[PDB]
């Protein structure tokens, strides 16, 4: 016999094609993703793993420690190291959604039931709070009275000061392209809704109405007006702003933003920040339980060999599935060479994982394929994992496991 | 309770001394469960007979089969107090290496590598 368990499953499982929008237990490597390709609640949640990585541009561990309890459902609690401020970050949810009507003559639209539920829970927590708190909820807003609407990334923050019993909402909005239309604006001759501000503020007031609370000035803090961005980018800005809100709230300084306090957008969302985001989304394979683990205990999640394997399976799947434009006078490796190398490497890594051993001719074959494994995008994937697995190279990764002769 | 308690050394010695050539090929193996192992089922048949050219790999596979679970949870086979950094070792060389004074090759299994 030959194949027993060369099976790729358990932590080496790559989710199937029909599990693609249905899988909330695991955030798989998406190896062709780019900041420009957009966000959803699962990628955002995945990105949360960066907060306690000390080597991330997004590291929070100087500003906050972890809340000893879990007083707020759906949220990760944090205690400022420089403040009395407690800070709650809601776990991203695809139901955190507000529709609005572009036409001012129609009503303000609606807020998803779960989002309104969260506002009520925030209010009930505040009524019992003895300490100043900040609540950070990522969400999306969409026009419902035009066809071809886009779901627009946006972020909500609420602070509660118990001394003045005041509760202050703010929305941070990274402006995307076509989040506005001159045609519409002209047709409505100016009474035009470009945001969910109306129904959302109404919601927040409806949530606090029975309590002692005063509603602070509601603020929409908008940025990147012309740095003219794809909807895609806006999600990355949202994540960056989650970071800024947390740090600024723990240091008790005003939240500073491109266009207010930051000199350029990419001084805010920095190429380093972008590489961090991209590498997390493209190259890593992370459980929900692992992320909840990280955030609730305040610790890094070390990259695991199985993630390297799963990433390789995704790069492999993508290229085998598709049909590339096959172009001429081509410098560099063919699709076929690369897929052969990937398959070789997956087999070798999985052999190392299960059997803790590698044949010497296996090692010889690997050695023949290493340059192809190191080239281009594949090279960037391999390099991410080599780096995080603490190996100087494929050879120096694999070599302790080879049985010679 | 263990096979060394159930058969005397003399008895064991005559078991090995011949089941050896009524299967001249084969090598005798006692696989038992680590006494402090909380997480793994107890398969019972202790005494096993294995073909020689076989390496530890396949043996691990069949014991992983009678234990009914999925290859995805940790399994380790220790030989005496000692065990493989190499799973490609033929059970013959392992036998000549780690065999007991009574002639049986003893192996114990666990979900962990503990002392």
Author numbering:
A (entry chain A): 25 to 429
B (entry chain B): 5 to 119
Text taken from the publication that reported this structure:
L. pneumophila inhibits autophagy by injecting an effector protein called RavZ into the cytoplasm. RavZ functions as a cysteine protease and irreversibly deconjugates mammalian Atg8s from PE to inhibit autophagosome formation. Unlike Atg4 that cleaves the amide bond between terminal glycine and PE, RavZ cleaves the amide bond before glycine. As a consequence, the RavZ-cleaved Atg8 proteins cannot be relipidated, leading to inhibition of autophagy.
To understand how RavZ recognizes LC3 before extraction, we solved the crystal structure of the RavZ1–431:LC31–119 complex at 2.5 Å. However, the complex displays only a relatively small binding interface (300 Å2). Nevertheless, the structure of RavZ in the complex shows a well-defined resolution of flexible loops, which are missing in the free-structure. Importantly, the N-terminal loop containing the LIR2 motif (residues 25 to 48) is resolved in the structure. LIR2 of RavZ interacts with the α2-β3 loop of LC3 instead of the canonic LIR-binding site that involves hydrophobic pockets located in β1, β2 and α3. Further analysis of the crystal contacts between symmetry-related RavZ molecules (RavZa and RavZb) shows that LIR2 of RavZa interacts extensively with RavZb, involving the α3 loop and the β6-β7 loop. Comparing with the free-RavZ structure, the α3 loop in the complex moves ca. 9 Å inward, suggesting a dynamic nature of this region. Key hydrophobic interactions include F29 (RavZa) with Y211 (RavZb), L31 (RavZa) with I170 (RavZb), L208 (RavZb) and F212 (RavZb). It is conceivable that the crystal packing led to a low-energy binding configuration involving interaction of LIR2 with the α3 loop of its symmetric mate.
